[PDB]
């Protein structure tokens, strides 16, 4: 998945 702080 996408890391907690990603965008």
């Amino acid at each position, epitope marked *: *998945e*996408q*890391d*907690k*702080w*990603a965008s």
Partner: antibody
Amino acid sequence: RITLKESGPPLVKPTQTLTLTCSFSGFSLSDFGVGVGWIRQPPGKALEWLAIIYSDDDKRYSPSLNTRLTITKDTSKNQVVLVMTRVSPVDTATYFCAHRRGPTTLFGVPIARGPVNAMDVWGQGITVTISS
Amino acid sequence: ALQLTQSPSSLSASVGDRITITCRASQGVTSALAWYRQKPGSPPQLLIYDASSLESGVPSRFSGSGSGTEFTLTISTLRPEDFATYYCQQLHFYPHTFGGGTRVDVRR
């Protein structure tokens, strides 16, 4: 000053359950966006990521070990516990816990996420041998 | 999953050299990449976070650049304490992968 230290049994037998504790000081697992993760290193091998837990209590695990890992926190004792079930000899490794910064805030407003991209402080590591 | 390949896996050098270690990811990880130096018997130590930011208290000879799928760590003037193994770590996708490491040893 942030410091972390791992504790648990140095020796464990196959099929048994391994419980490792990370006790830390210098930060609280109630601080904004902070994380504590676990990484292991079999002798002579590369680092291998295991899991991480954040202060808002989101948990994530290595997909390869997901079924055998449980990570939990005890905020008031400043500890993070990682439980690995059904260990086998290949689980012998040095186990490290580590701090992960949360975003920088300005007047309690998140303004920089670059500091979360690293595990910035590590514990000395605890050597665990799995043998019957 | 995501693959992080370090190059070279091993490298020889002498005090005063400039070395550069590179790490390539199988899919883009934006700037979420960290470099560490690990000396024998010790835990890894953070050198560079977020691909290029110098970690506080880390000597200026260490430098990191790149984003996306290709990153590099360069030590401009190798000191004796730099004979060690270096690792890169990706933090964009779970699981937060580590590269295979690159061993830097005394050339002879």
